Design a binder for these strands. Structure first.
Length: 53
DNA sequence: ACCGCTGCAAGGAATAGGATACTTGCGGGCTATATGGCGGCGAATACCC
């Protein structure tokens, strides 16, 4: 299990750096204002989404 | 009971990379000052009576 908190301050490289080593790790991602790339990626179905408002 | 040594602090530069805004390089898409040709003719001045 990985838990990247406040993902919008890392960049793509830092986010998949650990993913490359452990290919099948379960990435949990917490944030409040996602950077547009990962927000579109979530809204397009690539990643599951959960809204807490 | 003096002294050279060791060790525990002090003193910070250069990059990665996500930001934020500057700086400009450009390309398409616009606006805006002579000196080697005559011949003929009719009309417009000049003039000196």
């Amino acid at each position: 299990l990985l838990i990247v908190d406040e993902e919008h301050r890392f960049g793509v490289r830092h986010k998949e750096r650990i993913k490359a080593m452990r290919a099948n790790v379960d990435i949990l991602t917490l944030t409040a204002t996602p950077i547009p790339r990962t927000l579109n990626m979530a809204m397009s179905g690539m990643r599951d989404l959960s809204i807490i408002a």
